Amino acid sequence: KAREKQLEEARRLAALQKRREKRKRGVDYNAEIPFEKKPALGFYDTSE
Amino acid sequence: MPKPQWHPPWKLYRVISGHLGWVRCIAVEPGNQWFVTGSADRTIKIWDLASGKLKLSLTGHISTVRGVIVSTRSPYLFSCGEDKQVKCWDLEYNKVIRHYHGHLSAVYGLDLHPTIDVLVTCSRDSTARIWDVRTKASVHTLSGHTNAVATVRCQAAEPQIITGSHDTTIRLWDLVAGKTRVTLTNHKKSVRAVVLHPRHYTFASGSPDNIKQWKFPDGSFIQNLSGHNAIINTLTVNSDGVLVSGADNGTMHLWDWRTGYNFQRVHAAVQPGSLDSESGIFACAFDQSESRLLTAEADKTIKVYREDDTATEETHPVSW
Amino acid sequence: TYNRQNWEDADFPILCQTCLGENPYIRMTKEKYGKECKICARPFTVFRWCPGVRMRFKKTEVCQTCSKLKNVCQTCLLDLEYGLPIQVRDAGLSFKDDMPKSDVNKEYYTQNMEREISNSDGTRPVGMLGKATSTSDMLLKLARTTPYYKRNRPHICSFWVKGECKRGEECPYRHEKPTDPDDPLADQNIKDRYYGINDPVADKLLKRASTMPRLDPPEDKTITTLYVGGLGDTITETDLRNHFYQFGEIRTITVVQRQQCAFIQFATRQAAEVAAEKSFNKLIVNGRRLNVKWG
Amino acid sequence: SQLSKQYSSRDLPSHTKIKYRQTTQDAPEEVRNRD
Amino acid sequence: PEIHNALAIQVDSEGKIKYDAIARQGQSKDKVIYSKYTDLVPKEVMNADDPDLQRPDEEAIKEITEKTRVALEKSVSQKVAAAMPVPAQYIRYTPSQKQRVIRMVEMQKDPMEPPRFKINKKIPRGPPSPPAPVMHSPSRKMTVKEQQE
Amino acid sequence: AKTVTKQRVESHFDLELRAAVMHDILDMMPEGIKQNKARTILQHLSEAWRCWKANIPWKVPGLPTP
Amino acid sequence: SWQPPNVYLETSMGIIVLELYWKHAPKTCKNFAELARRGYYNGTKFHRIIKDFMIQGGDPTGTGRGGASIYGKQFEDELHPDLKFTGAGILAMANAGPDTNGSQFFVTLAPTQWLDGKHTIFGRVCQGIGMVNRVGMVETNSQDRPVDDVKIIKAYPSG
Amino acid sequence: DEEELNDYKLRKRKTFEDNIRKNRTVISNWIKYAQWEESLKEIQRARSIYERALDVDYRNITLWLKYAEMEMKNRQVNHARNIWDRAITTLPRVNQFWYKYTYMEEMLGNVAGARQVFERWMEWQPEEQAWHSYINFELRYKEVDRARTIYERFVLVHPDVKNWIKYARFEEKHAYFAHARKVYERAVEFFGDEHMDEHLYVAFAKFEENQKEFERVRVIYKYALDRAQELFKNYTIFEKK
Ligand SMILES: [Zn+2]
Ligand SMILES: [Zn+2]
């Protein structure tokens, strides 16, 4: 919990240290939708 | 509102004991000379039809034998177990000659095509597999049921494959694509047994909700038989139209196929040394003569009923 | 856990006229599962052949499912309807399709659309065919119609780049000196050209398409009367009236042979601006090349 | 799986024939006429 | 002369908008969809002596058996070709943009050659078929005695 | 899929027994009941089998009859 | 004779009362009125369906280039200045070829001056123009023909 | 702090995807993931999460309710109408979907097409609450003859003495006294005429007491002739009146 948050903060500090100074075939959750299932439309939906 | 016909009732005339496990399935030799019971003692026991003597007993399934069928045109025994295996047995050497392996979970039922001679096996991994008999290869894998498929019917008419599963749906399959074409969600409970009429191009489905009669090939919903609303594990129909519905509470309910009129409600007894919970019907099957009824009870007994031949229409009236 | 994309095992590669070549009498080779797709990595059907004489022995790059997705060439990776990059066509018509960048989601979505095409007819550039019919708005000012063979021209002899091709003219690679490596047009990432993202050829053709005033016109100070130079007496008032009858009513259709001016003016200002944008060095009225300006 | 190249020794071609019921083995031609 | 994204509305004249076109989503018209109250209601009991309530007999059964047997034997031969260890055609291409003659020839695939690509790709499964309209009887609401029963 | 060998007999047998318990417990449930409590039924069954192994009289008076 | 100044059509799509310019295209109006009296264009499918531009239906060939007309096989495409495919609610004859006009009615609620020079305009749909636009706004395949076929139920060729 | 928020969102999305891959059946991870995306204002991503949750299991009421509720709370009103259309066409036997879609398209929508949809549910024949709510929505749309036809359809579908008494009271309150007397006569001669419960007869006697009390005395005498203590008290009240 708190130790995991402190480890994440230390990893973020190491990340900014490495940025100041691959992805191993992962799935980038923030960059796009992890799996896309589009909603169906019918008799409506000119969207926004 | 038609007046229903009078099928005569039935009476119990022999009870066979001797299994140390639950009598899971009953198959009859197609020449009606003997029958065979696959038990939960992992025993495939050939019994005499007339004398009732134990002809033979075989082992080999490491888990519970769920299904036993003997081929009507080949001298082969196809026994599916819960050990994710199906054994093909040559009865001339009385040996397992062929092995069907590839289901990821325990196989609960099997069926054969009467003319194409192809195997379909419904299992606990929510799938059935369609195997060539000789080469033991699953040339198809039917999927689409979300729950484990309780039973499968393989008929020569259209559609060939009728799968009843525990996700309250019935799937009716086009065989040549291996794809489901009709799906019936109308049962509120788990579809555990289905029975086909051999001539009327119709079938019925037993569930804890109700019994539902349909019609091939689109699955058009003919009738809803209320009553016998327990967990109907097994079903059979006569050439007369005598429908026997057997549930896991040990009661037999007997009906007309056409009108759906329940003409008989008989609860059988149990073994002397047995619990009251040990009354549950795993396989009801007519003989090839359509004269004797074999019920596979959960107190490790086989109860065979005869027709109540002394019955008349005024001693046993047809209600409404 | 038993999921995979199926293999592109099919004939009929959908190719450009440019990579297709000039010979009607074509000898052909086909590998079944020789290579994999360059984008979705399915094992696809390789089509290798010789279109002409001075050749690369050209062959297909990506799978037929990816080509069915994007309507581009299997070799040239440019759009089959116009000869343009898919970045140019997506900027012209619709750029809301895109593709996921992660490999697992890309393969899963590729399996989903592969199942969709397998349940579909088979010869269709997916969903935006219904919105891609509105073409020749501006992209056909620079869309190719000629079969371009200088991109089918074979690769450069790197041995004679080093000056050491002892074969000379026996070497089938090109004995001409290469292009500029510092030129960003020489970079050409294949995944970028597929995705329609920052392709330098597409940016160069967009920069070129920003140069011509093919639909600018409007040199008249809030006046519908636009004078089309280059018309002369060949373009009369009847051609301008027939052009403005589709846009509505013609307020002033006239021809002046002194200034060679086709004076076109619709009744509506928007219709007059649309007619001037059509005739601003992009339309011909009665066989006369019109170029819209102030009138 | 249409693509696998691993072959078990239980996956070999074996028992490829199917014997059928003769008239001594209760053939379906006599099952129909027999009651 | 004197003047100078939704879905398609499927109205079968008197029937105000067929909602079976909403009940099927990517499913084609060949699949039967039980979606109406007419689909929900049963049929009345009638005469079982009926060619509607009879089999399509041995000729149609045997033709179905032969066609299914031929297709399944084709599938078995495909499985033997896929699991068992071991012409210059003249076609016309129409580019629609001239028409060309292709001497369609395949190449010699090498048996002195290992498998190329790894086929143990573990990706998550795709979406299933679109769901059926859940036809059921109207529900029997349980009492509170039934709920702590 | 792997064969059920000698070392995997009891685990697969208890797994299939538990799956049979789930299939034979999902089917007398009527409409309603959010607290299905199949984990609690598994705890009741495991305590019943453990008390039969221990020859202890096992009884939960709050338990439905079928 | 059968020279309809207006024609009424009630079908599944709705009711359209299209005024036919008999003073502009007299031979085309006579052919359309005699074909409506004989039932030649009634009940046939919607042949041509452009993306909200032209909806031609009633062709016996079903493609939009054929169609049996009452002027003798295919009617003469006799266009006039008073009857041009423009404005809202334009009714035309299905003339996809030169001097070959079918008895199919074509609805164009937008300016269709490209089809006006090649197709004879029957007249201006003063009533039912919104229903004609709603019929013509339905998308079709690449041959301007959708899966759904629009037929004709009842027709009144008054005049 | 943008890269720190991206790393936090990556960690939270990775733990959400780990909970999904651990238990695909448990929809609480899907619901919390979708509400986390809605709190992070990824509305289309939350729509994708709800769509994949419905693809895994479409049989949950709360998934459709949550996704319709977030589409209604956002600007996705037409998308919420799509959600309700799919939920109706997949589950026509769920009363809460019908009630919530007609409430949303009657308050936020104010659509009489929603009343036509609710009449399509009347052709699916619900319980009495839905028929009375369609009667009350016809009265809120200020058409009393429409609500009379809806109550006549309810008397045809689920016939009851209380339903026919409610029809008589509705026709009396809809300024149709002759139709109220005809409804009372049809309740006497149709709604349990063979049963003879003497309650529709008592309601007809009350309607005839509202109209003309000689007919009330005749109806009470006929009910006392057809019938008990209540009929004797009604005949005594008609004699004393
Ligand atoms: Zn090309
Ligand atoms: Zn690809």
Side-chain angles (χ1 to χ4, degrees), chain C residues 1 3 17 21-24 26 28 30 33 115, chain E residues 100-101 103 105-107 116-117 121 123-125 127:
Chain C
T1 183
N3 205 42
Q17 193 44 256
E22 69 274 347
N23 292 138
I26 297 169
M28 188 66 204
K30 165 168 79 154
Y33 305 125
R115 178 199 42 205
Chain E
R100 291 163 186 257
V101 177
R103 188 198 145 207
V105 180
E106 286 196 358
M107 61 80 71
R116 301 139 158 152
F117 323 112
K121 293 305 185 294
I123 57 173
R125 275 188 301 272

PDB file of all heavy atoms in Angstrom, chain C residues 1 3 17 21-24 26 28 30 33 115, chain E residues 100-101 103 105-107 116-117 121 123-125 127:
ATOM      1  N   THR C   1      -7.599 -18.329 -25.397  1.00  0.00           N
ATOM      2  CA  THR C   1      -6.234 -18.829 -25.291  1.00  0.00           C
ATOM      3  C   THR C   1      -5.858 -19.648 -26.522  1.00  0.00           C
ATOM      4  O   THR C   1      -4.697 -20.017 -26.705  1.00  0.00           O
ATOM      5  CB  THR C   1      -6.043 -19.685 -24.024  1.00  0.00           C
ATOM      6  OG1 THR C   1      -4.674 -20.090 -23.919  1.00  0.00           O
ATOM      7  CG2 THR C   1      -6.934 -20.919 -24.069  1.00  0.00           C
ATOM      8  N   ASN C   3      -6.602 -18.444 -29.697  1.00  0.00           N
ATOM      9  CA  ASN C   3      -6.940 -17.433 -30.686  1.00  0.00           C
ATOM     10  C   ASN C   3      -5.720 -17.107 -31.534  1.00  0.00           C
ATOM     11  O   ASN C   3      -4.606 -16.995 -31.011  1.00  0.00           O
ATOM     12  CB  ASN C   3      -7.464 -16.168 -30.005  1.00  0.00           C
ATOM     13  CG  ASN C   3      -8.364 -15.354 -30.906  1.00  0.00           C
ATOM     14  OD1 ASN C   3      -9.207 -15.901 -31.614  1.00  0.00           O
ATOM     15  ND2 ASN C   3      -8.192 -14.037 -30.883  1.00  0.00           N
ATOM     16  N   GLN C  17      -1.922  -0.302 -61.675  1.00  0.00           N
ATOM     17  CA  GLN C  17      -1.488  -0.369 -63.066  1.00  0.00           C
ATOM     18  C   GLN C  17       0.002  -0.080 -63.195  1.00  0.00           C
ATOM     19  O   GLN C  17       0.665  -0.628 -64.086  1.00  0.00           O
ATOM     20  CB  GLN C  17      -2.304   0.608 -63.916  1.00  0.00           C
ATOM     21  CG  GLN C  17      -2.175   0.409 -65.421  1.00  0.00           C
ATOM     22  CD  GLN C  17      -2.249  -1.048 -65.832  1.00  0.00           C
ATOM     23  OE1 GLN C  17      -1.233  -1.672 -66.143  1.00  0.00           O
ATOM     24  NE2 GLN C  17      -3.454  -1.598 -65.839  1.00  0.00           N
ATOM     25  N   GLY C  21       2.411  -2.878 -64.729  1.00  0.00           N
ATOM     26  CA  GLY C  21       3.314  -2.758 -65.852  1.00  0.00           C
ATOM     27  C   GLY C  21       2.617  -2.439 -67.158  1.00  0.00           C
ATOM     28  O   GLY C  21       1.546  -1.830 -67.206  1.00  0.00           O
ATOM     29  N   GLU C  22       3.260  -2.864 -68.247  1.00  0.00           N
ATOM     30  CA  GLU C  22       2.785  -2.593 -69.595  1.00  0.00           C
ATOM     31  C   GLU C  22       2.557  -3.838 -70.434  1.00  0.00           C
ATOM     32  O   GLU C  22       1.880  -3.747 -71.463  1.00  0.00           O
ATOM     33  CB  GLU C  22       3.770  -1.677 -70.344  1.00  0.00           C
ATOM     34  CG  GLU C  22       5.111  -2.318 -70.688  1.00  0.00           C
ATOM     35  CD  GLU C  22       6.121  -2.226 -69.558  1.00  0.00           C
ATOM     36  OE1 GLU C  22       5.875  -1.463 -68.601  1.00  0.00           O
ATOM     37  OE2 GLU C  22       7.158  -2.917 -69.628  1.00  0.00           O
ATOM     38  N   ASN C  23       3.085  -4.983 -70.032  1.00  0.00           N
ATOM     39  CA  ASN C  23       2.943  -6.191 -70.832  1.00  0.00           C
ATOM     40  C   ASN C  23       1.570  -6.812 -70.603  1.00  0.00           C
ATOM     41  O   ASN C  23       1.170  -7.005 -69.453  1.00  0.00           O
ATOM     42  CB  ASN C  23       4.033  -7.198 -70.489  1.00  0.00           C
ATOM     43  CG  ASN C  23       5.406  -6.734 -70.919  1.00  0.00           C
ATOM     44  OD1 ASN C  23       6.382  -6.885 -70.185  1.00  0.00           O
ATOM     45  ND2 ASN C  23       5.489  -6.161 -72.112  1.00  0.00           N
ATOM     46  N   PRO C  24       0.814  -7.106 -71.663  1.00  0.00           N
ATOM     47  CA  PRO C  24      -0.406  -7.903 -71.476  1.00  0.00           C
ATOM     48  C   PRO C  24      -0.126  -9.385 -71.329  1.00  0.00           C
ATOM     49  O   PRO C  24      -1.003 -10.123 -70.870  1.00  0.00           O
ATOM     50  CB  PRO C  24      -1.215  -7.604 -72.743  1.00  0.00           C
ATOM     51  CG  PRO C  24      -0.183  -7.284 -73.767  1.00  0.00           C
ATOM     52  CD  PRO C  24       0.956  -6.617 -73.044  1.00  0.00           C
ATOM     53  N   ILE C  26       1.769 -11.984 -69.427  1.00  0.00           N
ATOM     54  CA  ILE C  26       2.404 -11.939 -68.112  1.00  0.00           C
ATOM     55  C   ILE C  26       2.660 -13.357 -67.618  1.00  0.00           C
ATOM     56  O   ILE C  26       1.736 -14.177 -67.561  1.00  0.00           O
ATOM     57  CB  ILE C  26       1.528 -11.166 -67.111  1.00  0.00           C
ATOM     58  CG1 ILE C  26       1.375  -9.714 -67.556  1.00  0.00           C
ATOM     59  CG2 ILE C  26       2.112 -11.220 -65.706  1.00  0.00           C
ATOM     60  CD1 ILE C  26       0.331  -8.945 -66.781  1.00  0.00           C
ATOM     61  N   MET C  28       3.961 -15.511 -64.207  1.00  0.00           N
ATOM     62  CA  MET C  28       3.591 -15.230 -62.827  1.00  0.00           C
ATOM     63  C   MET C  28       4.173 -16.302 -61.912  1.00  0.00           C
ATOM     64  O   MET C  28       4.273 -17.462 -62.315  1.00  0.00           O
ATOM     65  CB  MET C  28       2.062 -15.215 -62.722  1.00  0.00           C
ATOM     66  CG  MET C  28       1.508 -14.769 -61.414  1.00  0.00           C
ATOM     67  SD  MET C  28       1.964 -13.042 -61.297  1.00  0.00           S
ATOM     68  CE  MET C  28       1.928 -12.824 -59.547  1.00  0.00           C
ATOM     69  N   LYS C  30       3.801 -17.656 -57.643  1.00  0.00           N
ATOM     70  CA  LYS C  30       3.041 -17.524 -56.404  1.00  0.00           C
ATOM     71  C   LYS C  30       3.611 -18.457 -55.345  1.00  0.00           C
ATOM     72  O   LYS C  30       3.660 -19.675 -55.548  1.00  0.00           O
ATOM     73  CB  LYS C  30       1.559 -17.832 -56.632  1.00  0.00           C
ATOM     74  CG  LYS C  30       0.776 -18.061 -55.347  1.00  0.00           C
ATOM     75  CD  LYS C  30      -0.721 -18.075 -55.584  1.00  0.00           C
ATOM     76  CE  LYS C  30      -1.179 -19.402 -56.150  1.00  0.00           C
ATOM     77  NZ  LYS C  30      -2.600 -19.682 -55.814  1.00  0.00           N
ATOM     78  N   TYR C  33       2.823 -19.642 -48.507  1.00  0.00           N
ATOM     79  CA  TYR C  33       3.055 -19.007 -47.212  1.00  0.00           C
ATOM     80  C   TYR C  33       4.524 -18.651 -47.058  1.00  0.00           C
ATOM     81  O   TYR C  33       5.123 -18.854 -46.001  1.00  0.00           O
ATOM     82  CB  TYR C  33       2.633 -19.904 -46.053  1.00  0.00           C
ATOM     83  CG  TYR C  33       1.205 -20.386 -46.098  1.00  0.00           C
ATOM     84  CD1 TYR C  33       0.918 -21.746 -46.045  1.00  0.00           C
ATOM     85  CD2 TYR C  33       0.144 -19.488 -46.171  1.00  0.00           C
ATOM     86  CE1 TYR C  33      -0.385 -22.204 -46.075  1.00  0.00           C
ATOM     87  CE2 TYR C  33      -1.167 -19.935 -46.208  1.00  0.00           C
ATOM     88  CZ  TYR C  33      -1.421 -21.296 -46.157  1.00  0.00           C
ATOM     89  OH  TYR C  33      -2.715 -21.760 -46.186  1.00  0.00           O
ATOM     90  N   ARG C 115     -12.537 -11.728 -39.721  1.00  0.00           N
ATOM     91  CA  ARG C 115     -13.818 -12.420 -39.603  1.00  0.00           C
ATOM     92  C   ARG C 115     -14.945 -11.637 -40.273  1.00  0.00           C
ATOM     93  O   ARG C 115     -15.823 -12.237 -40.909  1.00  0.00           O
ATOM     94  CB  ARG C 115     -14.124 -12.662 -38.123  1.00  0.00           C
ATOM     95  CG  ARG C 115     -15.452 -13.336 -37.822  1.00  0.00           C
ATOM     96  CD  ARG C 115     -15.859 -13.103 -36.376  1.00  0.00           C
ATOM     97  NE  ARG C 115     -15.597 -11.729 -35.961  1.00  0.00           N
ATOM     98  CZ  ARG C 115     -15.388 -11.350 -34.709  1.00  0.00           C
ATOM     99  NH1 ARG C 115     -15.404 -12.218 -33.710  1.00  0.00           N
ATOM    100  NH2 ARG C 115     -15.161 -10.065 -34.449  1.00  0.00           N
TER     101      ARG C 115
ATOM    102  N   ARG E 100      -5.321  -7.978 -69.233  1.00  0.00           N
ATOM    103  CA  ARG E 100      -4.038  -8.648 -69.384  1.00  0.00           C
ATOM    104  C   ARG E 100      -4.168 -10.152 -69.205  1.00  0.00           C
ATOM    105  O   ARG E 100      -5.038 -10.639 -68.482  1.00  0.00           O
ATOM    106  CB  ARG E 100      -3.023  -8.096 -68.388  1.00  0.00           C
ATOM    107  CG  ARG E 100      -2.615  -6.678 -68.704  1.00  0.00           C
ATOM    108  CD  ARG E 100      -1.967  -6.020 -67.524  1.00  0.00           C
ATOM    109  NE  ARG E 100      -1.711  -4.610 -67.778  1.00  0.00           N
ATOM    110  CZ  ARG E 100      -0.521  -4.106 -68.069  1.00  0.00           C
ATOM    111  NH1 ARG E 100       0.558  -4.868 -68.115  1.00  0.00           N
ATOM    112  NH2 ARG E 100      -0.412  -2.804 -68.316  1.00  0.00           N
ATOM    113  N   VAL E 101      -3.287 -10.883 -69.879  1.00  0.00           N
ATOM    114  CA  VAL E 101      -3.239 -12.338 -69.809  1.00  0.00           C
ATOM    115  C   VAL E 101      -2.136 -12.729 -68.841  1.00  0.00           C
ATOM    116  O   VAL E 101      -0.962 -12.406 -69.056  1.00  0.00           O
ATOM    117  CB  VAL E 101      -2.996 -12.959 -71.192  1.00  0.00           C
ATOM    118  CG1 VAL E 101      -2.884 -14.467 -71.074  1.00  0.00           C
ATOM    119  CG2 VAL E 101      -4.109 -12.574 -72.145  1.00  0.00           C
ATOM    120  N   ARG E 103      -0.151 -15.816 -67.167  1.00  0.00           N
ATOM    121  CA  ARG E 103       0.256 -17.218 -67.108  1.00  0.00           C
ATOM    122  C   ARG E 103       0.492 -17.535 -65.639  1.00  0.00           C
ATOM    123  O   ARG E 103       1.610 -17.449 -65.128  1.00  0.00           O
ATOM    124  CB  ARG E 103       1.499 -17.459 -67.957  1.00  0.00           C
ATOM    125  CG  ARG E 103       1.888 -18.914 -68.120  1.00  0.00           C
ATOM    126  CD  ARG E 103       3.327 -19.028 -68.591  1.00  0.00           C
ATOM    127  NE  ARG E 103       4.005 -20.186 -68.022  1.00  0.00           N
ATOM    128  CZ  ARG E 103       5.314 -20.268 -67.829  1.00  0.00           C
ATOM    129  NH1 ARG E 103       6.124 -19.271 -68.146  1.00  0.00           N
ATOM    130  NH2 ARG E 103       5.823 -21.378 -67.302  1.00  0.00           N
ATOM    131  N   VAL E 105       1.304 -19.378 -62.654  1.00  0.00           N
ATOM    132  CA  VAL E 105       2.161 -20.529 -62.374  1.00  0.00           C
ATOM    133  C   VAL E 105       2.536 -20.466 -60.896  1.00  0.00           C
ATOM    134  O   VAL E 105       2.858 -19.389 -60.385  1.00  0.00           O
ATOM    135  CB  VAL E 105       3.429 -20.528 -63.263  1.00  0.00           C
ATOM    136  CG1 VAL E 105       4.337 -21.719 -62.981  1.00  0.00           C
ATOM    137  CG2 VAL E 105       3.096 -20.482 -64.745  1.00  0.00           C
ATOM    138  N   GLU E 106       2.468 -21.602 -60.206  1.00  0.00           N
ATOM    139  CA  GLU E 106       2.963 -21.688 -58.838  1.00  0.00           C
ATOM    140  C   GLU E 106       4.435 -22.089 -58.820  1.00  0.00           C
ATOM    141  O   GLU E 106       5.003 -22.515 -59.826  1.00  0.00           O
ATOM    142  CB  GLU E 106       2.153 -22.693 -58.023  1.00  0.00           C
ATOM    143  CG  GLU E 106       0.779 -22.211 -57.622  1.00  0.00           C
ATOM    144  CD  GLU E 106       0.174 -23.060 -56.525  1.00  0.00           C
ATOM    145  OE1 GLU E 106       0.823 -24.042 -56.107  1.00  0.00           O
ATOM    146  OE2 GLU E 106      -0.950 -22.749 -56.081  1.00  0.00           O
ATOM    147  N   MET E 107       5.050 -21.960 -57.649  1.00  0.00           N
ATOM    148  CA  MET E 107       6.451 -22.314 -57.494  1.00  0.00           C
ATOM    149  C   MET E 107       6.596 -23.670 -56.807  1.00  0.00           C
ATOM    150  O   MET E 107       5.634 -24.254 -56.307  1.00  0.00           O
ATOM    151  CB  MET E 107       7.198 -21.204 -56.744  1.00  0.00           C
ATOM    152  CG  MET E 107       6.735 -20.876 -55.314  1.00  0.00           C
ATOM    153  SD  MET E 107       7.253 -21.927 -53.936  1.00  0.00           S
ATOM    154  CE  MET E 107       8.989 -21.504 -53.839  1.00  0.00           C
ATOM    155  N   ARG E 116       8.387 -22.113 -40.985  1.00  0.00           N
ATOM    156  CA  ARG E 116       8.903 -20.750 -41.037  1.00  0.00           C
ATOM    157  C   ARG E 116       8.564 -19.961 -39.777  1.00  0.00           C
ATOM    158  O   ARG E 116       9.453 -19.406 -39.124  1.00  0.00           O
ATOM    159  CB  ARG E 116       8.346 -20.029 -42.267  1.00  0.00           C
ATOM    160  CG  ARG E 116       8.680 -20.679 -43.589  1.00  0.00           C
ATOM    161  CD  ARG E 116       7.474 -20.644 -44.500  1.00  0.00           C
ATOM    162  NE  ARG E 116       7.834 -20.758 -45.908  1.00  0.00           N
ATOM    163  CZ  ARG E 116       7.042 -21.265 -46.841  1.00  0.00           C
ATOM    164  NH1 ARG E 116       5.828 -21.706 -46.553  1.00  0.00           N
ATOM    165  NH2 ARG E 116       7.475 -21.327 -48.096  1.00  0.00           N
ATOM    166  N   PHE E 117       7.285 -19.905 -39.427  1.00  0.00           N
ATOM    167  CA  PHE E 117       6.779 -18.961 -38.446  1.00  0.00           C
ATOM    168  C   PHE E 117       6.244 -19.690 -37.220  1.00  0.00           C
ATOM    169  O   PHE E 117       5.799 -20.838 -37.304  1.00  0.00           O
ATOM    170  CB  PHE E 117       5.682 -18.094 -39.066  1.00  0.00           C
ATOM    171  CG  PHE E 117       5.939 -17.735 -40.504  1.00  0.00           C
ATOM    172  CD1 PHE E 117       5.141 -18.254 -41.515  1.00  0.00           C
ATOM    173  CD2 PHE E 117       6.987 -16.890 -40.846  1.00  0.00           C
ATOM    174  CE1 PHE E 117       5.372 -17.927 -42.843  1.00  0.00           C
ATOM    175  CE2 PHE E 117       7.228 -16.558 -42.174  1.00  0.00           C
ATOM    176  CZ  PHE E 117       6.417 -17.078 -43.172  1.00  0.00           C
ATOM    177  N   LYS E 121       0.731 -18.414 -30.945  1.00  0.00           N
ATOM    178  CA  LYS E 121       0.402 -17.028 -30.640  1.00  0.00           C
ATOM    179  C   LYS E 121      -0.762 -17.004 -29.661  1.00  0.00           C
ATOM    180  O   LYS E 121      -1.878 -17.417 -29.996  1.00  0.00           O
ATOM    181  CB  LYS E 121       0.076 -16.262 -31.919  1.00  0.00           C
ATOM    182  CG  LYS E 121       1.276 -16.080 -32.835  1.00  0.00           C
ATOM    183  CD  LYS E 121       2.438 -15.427 -32.099  1.00  0.00           C
ATOM    184  CE  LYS E 121       3.594 -15.132 -33.035  1.00  0.00           C
ATOM    185  NZ  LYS E 121       4.202 -16.380 -33.563  1.00  0.00           N
ATOM    186  N   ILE E 123      -3.162 -14.802 -28.025  1.00  0.00           N
ATOM    187  CA  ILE E 123      -3.874 -13.528 -27.963  1.00  0.00           C
ATOM    188  C   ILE E 123      -5.246 -13.818 -27.374  1.00  0.00           C
ATOM    189  O   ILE E 123      -5.716 -14.969 -27.421  1.00  0.00           O
ATOM    190  CB  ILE E 123      -3.957 -12.850 -29.351  1.00  0.00           C
ATOM    191  CG1 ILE E 123      -4.627 -13.767 -30.367  1.00  0.00           C
ATOM    192  CG2 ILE E 123      -2.571 -12.447 -29.829  1.00  0.00           C
ATOM    193  CD1 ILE E 123      -4.898 -13.106 -31.699  1.00  0.00           C
ATOM    194  N   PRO E 124      -5.893 -12.827 -26.755  1.00  0.00           N
ATOM    195  CA  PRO E 124      -7.264 -13.038 -26.274  1.00  0.00           C
ATOM    196  C   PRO E 124      -8.249 -13.207 -27.420  1.00  0.00           C
ATOM    197  O   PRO E 124      -8.028 -12.760 -28.547  1.00  0.00           O
ATOM    198  CB  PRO E 124      -7.566 -11.770 -25.468  1.00  0.00           C
ATOM    199  CG  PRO E 124      -6.550 -10.782 -25.904  1.00  0.00           C
ATOM    200  CD  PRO E 124      -5.334 -11.575 -26.215  1.00  0.00           C
ATOM    201  N   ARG E 125      -9.348 -13.888 -27.105  1.00  0.00           N
ATOM    202  CA  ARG E 125     -10.329 -14.279 -28.104  1.00  0.00           C
ATOM    203  C   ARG E 125     -11.141 -13.079 -28.580  1.00  0.00           C
ATOM    204  O   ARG E 125     -11.211 -12.033 -27.927  1.00  0.00           O
ATOM    205  CB  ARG E 125     -11.262 -15.347 -27.540  1.00  0.00           C
ATOM    206  CG  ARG E 125     -10.723 -16.759 -27.658  1.00  0.00           C
ATOM    207  CD  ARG E 125     -11.780 -17.774 -27.271  1.00  0.00           C
ATOM    208  NE  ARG E 125     -12.250 -17.567 -25.907  1.00  0.00           N
ATOM    209  CZ  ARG E 125     -11.693 -18.106 -24.833  1.00  0.00           C
ATOM    210  NH1 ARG E 125     -10.641 -18.904 -24.926  1.00  0.00           N
ATOM    211  NH2 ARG E 125     -12.202 -17.840 -23.633  1.00  0.00           N
ATOM    212  N   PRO E 127     -14.744 -11.166 -30.131  1.00  0.00           N
ATOM    213  CA  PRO E 127     -16.122 -11.079 -29.657  1.00  0.00           C
ATOM    214  C   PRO E 127     -16.968 -12.189 -30.251  1.00  0.00           C
ATOM    215  O   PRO E 127     -16.694 -12.671 -31.365  1.00  0.00           O
ATOM    216  CB  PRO E 127     -16.581  -9.695 -30.157  1.00  0.00           C
ATOM    217  CG  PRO E 127     -15.326  -8.963 -30.506  1.00  0.00           C
ATOM    218  CD  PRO E 127     -14.388 -10.018 -30.979  1.00  0.00           C
TER     219      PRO E 127
END
